[PDB]
RNA sequence: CUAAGAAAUUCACGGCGGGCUUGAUGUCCGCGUCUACCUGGUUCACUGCCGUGUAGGCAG
């Protein structure tokens, strides 16, 4: 995508940057389900891979009209006193490219216990011997917190910036703005 | 290069029999505990779906 917009978290004593970036991510999720499409990307240039910290910035990549329409919508209403805006500008040249991949780990064996017991009609002890407790995976990835609306649960989405490439290919994005084959310019 | 250098304690055994500890008793007067703070600190790692799959993803 040719256009990027930077939003920076206004540093707040009342709330730490983790909650402000997660509620920005949640309202961006609501905005992207309200707008639809598969061609809206996100990126995080203040990523610190040593401490798995996302930083304070968010660069949303799309066209000019898409970002200009996303500025004048109520998905930022009630938030605009907690973040500073950029401007929709062209990506400079040249930049390396990378993806934004959500990596879900199977760190909870109870979901796998329920899955195997439901689809196979086995026993609890047969499933307990089938999968052990050592199937829990540990992630050193940055994460964000969101709240669900209809049936509610707070869950951490883990983001991974992939390896740097020289040329991106075609691909879509979710209603979350994460990579499904598409890439975002990294700068 | 050490008041260095060295060393086998050990065999066996019946402690028990008996007994009244008692009477008596006033704890007690008195007391200012106060003042002021965001339990959230991503830490609610969930719920379901596609997939034979535990391999891999998805949706909120």
């Amino acid at each position: 995508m040719d256009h990027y917009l930077d939003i920076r978290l206004r540093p707040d004593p009342e709330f730490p940057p983790a909650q402000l970036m997660s509620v920005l991510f949640g309202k961006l999720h609501q905005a992207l389900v309200a707008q639809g499409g598969d061609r809206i990307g996100v990126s995080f240039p203040d990523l610190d891979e040593s401490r798995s910290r996302l930083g304070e910035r968010l660069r949303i990549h799309a066209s000019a009209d898409d970002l200009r329409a996303l500025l004048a919508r109520p998905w930022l209403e009630g938030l605009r006193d907690h973040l500073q805006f950029g401007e929709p500008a062209v990506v400079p040249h040249p930049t390396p490219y990378r993806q934004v991949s959500r990596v879900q780990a199977k760190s909870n064996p109870e979901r796998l216990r329920r899955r195997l017991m439901r689809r196979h009609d086995l026993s609890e002890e047969e499933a307990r011997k089938r999968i052990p407790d050592t199937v829990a995976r540990t992630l050193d990835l940055p994460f964000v917190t969101l709240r669900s609306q209809s049936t509610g649960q707070h869950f951490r989405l883990f983001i991974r910036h992939g390896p740097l490439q020289a040329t991106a290919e075609e691909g879509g994005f979710t209603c979350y703005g994460l990579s499904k084959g598409g890439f975002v310019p990294w700068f």
Side-chain angles (χ1 to χ4, degrees), chain A residues 1-38 40-50 52 54-76 78-105 107-117 119-121 123-125 127 131-136 138-146 148 150-169 171-187:
Chain A
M1 284 144 301
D2 54 38
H3 273 314
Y4 75 104
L5 173 148
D6 59 89
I7 45 183
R8 193 84 160 152
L9 262 61
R10 172 168 166 259
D12 197 351
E14 277 57 40
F15 314 103
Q19 311 159 193
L20 305 191
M21 68 206 196
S22 50
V23 304
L24 271 194
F25 211 56
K27 291 298 297 186
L28 201 133
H29 285 172
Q30 283 184 249
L32 186 42
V33 189
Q35 270 213 350
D38 268 11
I40 296 194
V42 307
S43 198
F44 312 99
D46 214 28
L47 173 56
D48 186 12
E49 272 90 332
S50 51
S52 81
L54 263 185
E56 323 205 329
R57 224 168 324 165
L58 184 160
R59 323 197 323 276
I60 167 168
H61 306 269
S63 44
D65 57 352
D66 190 2
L67 295 174
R68 264 291 310 122
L70 271 173
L71 288 153
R73 280 226 296 161
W75 74 284
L76 315 169
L79 308 179
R80 281 133 168 161
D81 57 354
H82 311 138
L83 74 166
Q84 74 215 60
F85 283 135
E87 46 100 3
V90 54
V91 189
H93 313 71
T95 173
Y97 265 72
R98 68 198 316 177
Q99 61 260 68
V100 286
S101 44
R102 174 188 177 266
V103 174
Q104 183 185 310
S107 312
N108 202 73
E110 202 187 0
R111 182 174 62 246
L112 269 297
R113 269 169 281 182
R114 264 184 299 270
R115 201 197 312 181
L116 164 69
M117 189 145 187
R119 74 142 183 273
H120 261 297
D121 260 14
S123 88
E124 291 217 320
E125 310 315 299
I131 43 151
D133 205 12
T134 50
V135 85
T138 58
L139 271 174
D140 312 308
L141 255 62
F143 64 98
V144 298
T145 185
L146 57 61
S148 316
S150 174
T151 59
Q153 278 104 39
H154 286 232
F155 173 59
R156 37 173 68 184
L157 188 161
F158 287 93
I159 318 164
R160 198 161 85 95
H161 274 180
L164 303 103
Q165 273 264 0
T167 299
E169 60 265 40
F173 295 92
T174 39
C175 295
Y176 286 173
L178 280 292
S179 286
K180 310 308 302 295
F183 293 82
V184 283
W186 167 257
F187 67 103

